[PDB]
Design a protein around this ligand. Sequence first.
Ligand code: ADP
Ligand code: ADP
Ligand code: 0F1
Ligand code: 0F1
Ligand code: K
Ligand code: K
Ligand code: MG
Ligand code: MG
Lengths: 310, 310
Amino acid sequence: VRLTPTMMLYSGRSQDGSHLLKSGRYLQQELPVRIAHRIKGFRSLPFIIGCNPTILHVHELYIRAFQKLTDFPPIKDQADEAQYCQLVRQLLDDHKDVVTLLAEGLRESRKHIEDEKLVRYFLDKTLTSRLGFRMLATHHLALHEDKPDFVGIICTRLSPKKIIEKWVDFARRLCEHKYGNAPRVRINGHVAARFPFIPMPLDYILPELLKNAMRATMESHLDTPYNVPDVVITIANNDVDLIIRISDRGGGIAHKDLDRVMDYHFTTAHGFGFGLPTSRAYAEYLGGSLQLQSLQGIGTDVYLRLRHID
Amino acid sequence: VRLTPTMMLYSGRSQDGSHLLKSGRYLQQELPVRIAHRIKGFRSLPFIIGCNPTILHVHELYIRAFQKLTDFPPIKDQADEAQYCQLVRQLLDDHKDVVTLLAEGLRESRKHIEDEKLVRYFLDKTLTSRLGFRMLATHHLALHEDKPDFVGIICTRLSPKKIIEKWVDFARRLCEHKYGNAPRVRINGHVAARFPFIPMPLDYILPELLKNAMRATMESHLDTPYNVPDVVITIANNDVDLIIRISDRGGGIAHKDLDRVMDYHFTTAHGFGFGLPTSRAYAEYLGGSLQLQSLQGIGTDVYLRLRHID
Ligand SMILES: Nc1ncnc2c1ncn2[C@@H]1O[C@H](COP(=O)(O)OP(=O)(O)O)[C@@H](O)[C@H]1O
Ligand SMILES: Nc1ncnc2c1ncn2[C@@H]1O[C@H](COP(=O)(O)OP(=O)(O)O)[C@@H](O)[C@H]1O
Ligand SMILES: O=C(O)c1sc2cc(Cl)ccc2c1Cl
Ligand SMILES: O=C(O)c1sc2cc(Cl)ccc2c1Cl
Ligand SMILES: [K+]
Ligand SMILES: [K+]
Ligand SMILES: [Mg+2]
Ligand SMILES: [Mg+2]
């Protein structure tokens, strides 16, 4: 019965599999309405934006998704549900490039309107409903599996340190490939903490912020790539939220860029311009936040806050 | 000709002392108008607040100050100016307890109105005009002196590290007296920096924040007062501003208190409740800011930003 924003992830067990049917019907009740909501969003886009071929592509994908979902017969038995799972999987696969297509689509078309507020509002709303969609969908699929410490996509005892480490190794590799080195990362504060949590949003955000911190460190120690300052991560765990402070000595975000870094499409180039604003939208959708503190000339502290599960 | 908020501190020299006369006339032109502005502020206070004996005391002090200032004859020669200096000194002495009297005065009387916004607005405005007053006045007096590296109260080559150190020693002493120990303080980033700057606002703010950070550290290591985590201060110096990050491992500001810590009179007790909101008002008056980042369960980062001199 664990819930986030007006939407619940179904926590429940049964040896026969009656939990699968109620979950499946929930998705069948929930998904279509929300795709429809996002189709209106496409219909309300400024005409010249909505006309861009890629914007239209994604537009069509969303209609197709609605069509397929509503055409599916109401679920009554395991064999129905099992086959609905096939459709959910197909949809996930089909829609995996959507963020990128949206980025490409809006890149040019966005300058052609005077209303700056509109695209931000559209992306925030589209991308966050989509996260909610992938969460709900991946959860249902995961409910089939019998993995240790997981009720669906909900880890019962998640380790912030362990997940940070997963993404550190990843980001370091990428950085080594581009620069020949990467900063070491140290992790302090509540390194021993374990609690119920959904990893998925951490899996988008963490690598984004790690990417940014590593780039900035390297791009400001171009004379000594072999010796760079560590990035330092602090985990704080309390009864209300989890806070992860990612703090670097990469020179800061310049005063001139400060007001634009949270803008979609804005970048100083790991070069697409979506890391910061997507991450923030995700965090706020989940009831937390993402806040920057620039120390121009020294570095940046990035604060990720996510609410605990009720 | 160095200026801050619609007001200029006079930078100039002369062996005969013609710079003193123009400065004196400036003060004579400026102070009265601004005292008058603050008298209206007293006149507009909710009646039941304005009636409190201490509030009235300060009210009278401001009238007396206006009376004395406007009664002073226009300045024409050194001997005039010299005597105006005596009056400025007297006013400074007379008004030194004003913040405290205001705190005592408003403590009870403030609950008696429904408008929470009003007292904050009154204090911010009164206390910041007063800082501007003491700055202008102390500057003029200082212009008599011939100290190295000082044009008035404007240090020509101020060292952030050195001023932080001054206030560290101070705060540590206070903390040792109360707890039997204090955290060591380390200072990193641009420790070698020197630039023109006015120390005065740093002299109010720095000890306030150092006080808060030391208390929190001790009040959360009550089992090991002999061994506490360091407070760590980071100086960043760029072309736009000076940033001083004061960061502690004192457990954070709790979610419940977070919205109230910037309120005048609010405190969890070094016990008066004015440190944070006064400091922030001062910083914003000077064109910078003061921002908190709580890591509940771990500690707090406090970010002080002050603009450089034009
Ligand atoms: N830790 C950081 N240090 C310095 N600059 C940063 C940091 N994080 C983000 N930025 C700046 O803000 C911009 C926006 O970042 P983002 O939205 O992730 O897009 P991208 O990283 O693809 O440019 C970056 O291009 C970079 O200029
Ligand atoms: N570094 C800090 N760590 C923990 N709590 C703090 C810190 N700074 C301020 N606070 C909290 O916010 C309150 C407001 O501080 P302030 O305005 O300086 O008043 P006072 O220190 O007199 O209580 C403090 O009482 C304390 O509870
Ligand atoms: O945009 C996406 O990634 C997804 S995944 C997904 C899964 C389902 Cl079951 C329905 C819609 C939908 C969308 Cl839209
Ligand atoms: O409130 C204060 O501290 C001061 S000092 C001060 C000095 C002068 Cl010259 C005039 C007013 C004035 C006030 Cl009000
Ligand atoms: K961006
Ligand atoms: K306070
Ligand atoms: Mg990025
Ligand atoms: Mg205080």
